[PDB]
Structure 1
Amino acid sequence: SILDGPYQPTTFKPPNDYWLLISSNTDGVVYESTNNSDFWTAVIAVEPHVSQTNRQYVLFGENKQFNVENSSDKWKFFEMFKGSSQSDFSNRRTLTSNNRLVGMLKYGGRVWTFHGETPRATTDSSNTADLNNISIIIHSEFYIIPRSQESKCNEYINNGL
């Protein structure tokens, strides 16, 4: 099947040319991805209707507090990015979604994810010189979809499983 899964939470270096479609089941860290060279992204899930609150997360072994908020009726998935070991995280992208799926693809020297607000979320890329070595710790169930079937992945991100 085009939609391969769901797989249990795990750690691995995903193969290039496949979307990971990650199904978030609670608030907190959805995944932590890095090559320990030029790419770090952790995604943090915040449930609907959350007034500003200090929450603490473990990101790549380090405790980080963020004041988070979500005034919408949809879940929000915040990408926290840094591009070097010695740099501060920034909320680089956000996906606002009732479907509670995020996507990550390693392809052609870039990491691709979905951002924006469903059902109109789009893909966006980050460059890396060290793509293959990007590993991911995934804290919930996920699926694997070939890049050739990205249209299906897009459909799931935007309209749900």
Structure 2
Amino acid sequence: GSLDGPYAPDSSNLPSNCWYLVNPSNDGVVFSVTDNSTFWMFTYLVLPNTAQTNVTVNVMNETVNISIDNSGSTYRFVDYIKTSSTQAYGSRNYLNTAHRLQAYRRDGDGNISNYWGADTQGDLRVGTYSNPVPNAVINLNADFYVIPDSQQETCTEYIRGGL
């Protein structure tokens, strides 16, 4: 397969209908997005064999706290989400993966899609979140590649088997 890039970390109203495969080297926030009105989302990368740790996250000009706990040898991308600024974030989905690879796509409605699952095999799934942010600034906080949603299958290949 082929991918446009890699491109450096960017914050902008990125084009919809294409997969942004992020390839972080380090843990922490790899992805975030908010319209400042209806939807707040960030993804925190947790290292394998990370004992229970209380960490402080400054993201989207907000500073919050999360508990990370990963007893596996796989990496874990954790999604946190809220629909109002005064609301507390909630963890909805996470992805256990051997590779530092997650991918995000904004559909025609502005909904955010990414890979969910307890593994990158049988439990792997392409999920979609339910609060559309069509014009919101998207923060890809890592080197990323660009794949058309034409080739969701090419993106899936790298998610399962690395790059």
TM-score range, shorter-chain basis?
over 0.9
Aligned residue number for residue 114 of structure 2: 113
Q: Could you tell me which amino acid in structure 2 is paired with residue 140 of structure 1?
A: A
Regions of 4+ moved over 3 Å? none
Aligned residue number for residue 151 of structure 1: 153
- Work out whether residues 17 and 147 of structure 1, in 8 Å CA contact, stay in contact via their aligned partners in 2: yes
- Work out whether residues 108 and 134 of structure 2, in 8 Å CA contact, stay in contact via their aligned partners in 1: no
| Unmatched 5+ stretches in structure 1 | none
In the alignment of these two chains, the number of paired residues is 160
- Work out whether residues 6 and 142 of structure 1, in 8 Å CA contact, stay in contact via their aligned partners in 2: yes
2:81 and 2:26 map into 1 onto residues whose CA distance is 21
Deviation at 1:2, TM superposition (A): 4.2
Deviation at 1:89, TM superposition (A): 0.4
TM-score by length of 2: 0.92
Over aligned residues, Cα RMSD in angstroms?
1.5
Q: Could you tell me which amino acid in structure 1 is paired with residue 116 of structure 2?
A: H
Matched, 1:85 2:85: yes
1:35 and 1:5 map into 2 onto residues whose CA distance is 26
- Work out whether residues 119 and 159 of structure 1, in 8 Å CA contact, stay in contact via their aligned partners in 2: no
1:108 and 1:54 map into 2 onto residues whose CA distance is 37
Q: Could you tell me which amino acid in structure 2 is paired with residue 22 of structure 1?
A: V
Deviation at 1:132, TM superposition (A): 2.1
Matched, 1:4 2:4: yes
* SS of structure 2 residue aligned to 1:151: helix
Aligned residue number for residue 137 of structure 1: 139
| Unmatched 5+ stretches in structure 2 | none
TM-score by length of 1: 0.93
- Work out whether residues 101 and 159 of structure 2, in 8 Å CA contact, stay in contact via their aligned partners in 1: yes
Change in 2 beyond 3 A, CA 1:99/1:54? same
